[PDB]
Amino acid sequence: ENLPQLKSAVDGLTEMSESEKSGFISLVSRYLSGIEWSKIQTPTDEIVVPYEKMTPVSQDVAETKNLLDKLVVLKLNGGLGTTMGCTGPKSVIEVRDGLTFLDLIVIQIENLNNKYGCKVPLVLMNSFNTHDDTHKIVEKYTNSNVDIHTFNQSKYPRVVADEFVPWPSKGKTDKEGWYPPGHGDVFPALMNSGKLDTFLSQGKEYVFVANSDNLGAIVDLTILKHLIQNKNEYCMEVTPKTLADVKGGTLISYEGKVQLLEIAQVPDEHVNEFKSIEKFKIFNTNNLWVNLKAIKKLVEADALKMEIIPNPKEVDGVKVLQLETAAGAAIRFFDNAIGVNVPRSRFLPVKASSDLLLVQSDLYTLVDGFVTRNKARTNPSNPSIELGPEFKKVATFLSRFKSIPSIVELDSLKVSGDVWFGSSIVLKGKVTVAAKSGVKLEIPDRAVVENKNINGPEDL
User: Which amino acids does the record list as binding UTP?
Assistant: First the structure.
């Protein structure tokens, strides 16, 4: 019903830039305008390329140099660590040995250029929640041998659902009036920066995208080599789905084209089949490799048309809407868009404290910018972890562990209630811990908990 209304309401927002104001239009335009089930299809291997079948690079550093010369390293740096009870960027948390996500990031790129002499650039995509703080943090890399760029993605106004007008217009101009429109915004933002054009002219042809908290997102020269062979404009790293990845976004062939399918395309009556991992086998790591010229072309041609992720939220009793999109969703707009199915050692992200237990234990070590998995670990799978809200805030997490217990032998751990952990504890097989009503527990140092379901102090 009409359109200039919401338009003038936004154009009056002095904050937003010209590249941000009209943009919020496509999303509002479409969302207000409008993937059918009976047409879905499972892609072939021709679409999803077996990692282990690709040609690796030779030892000839000249070849490595050539490839590493066309690559840029971008990190989505738009996200706070609020989910883990921590203030600051998600990447400023400490992974292992006092080093933060942004800290190892600047480390690994340096070791790749150190070993090959090239100078692969680091470009962090920020947002209003992490931009200025990042700019301040990165000064720590003043003498580092990497040119780290940063840019602020688009800022969009949340929408108050009822009246459906921009919230800042009603005067909500503080930080609560705005919302990071999803990571799908990585493409028009990289271009809105003016940095891609730069990179393009600089011999740069591809960009490897990954979450700032996926420790496995390391540059794979092989994947890059391949892209230049088949001339793939888009390449998504995917991996086999596990029980921890049921509702995850997968890859499908829809109307003869590759496409990501999130829970934002499947009806209620179909979620069951959707969640059937026997039907859909792999998921999206977000590890994405994208040809640069192809980006510019599609952004300058106002081509991208990602499915709007509605996303409603309540704020101070005000029900609002954050219109967002996903990056993996750009895969359909790219020529010879593929995806590569790789080992899970490339999808090691930190989403909660339960993952910090993992990477901070004996199951892993830091070896020259590399969250190295202990080879002693027999089973190929990592132990599952189930800590309660008592362990959600990293600060409390660390304190509830005088030292991180060995888990290299661990198969599973259940942890609920007011539980504390001494030092040099060892965990094997299946293990449970839980205090009772108004009860508190504290597992003593040197404890070797082996196949137990701790339900009370009455359990040594």
Answer: 76-79, 90, 153, 182, 213, 351
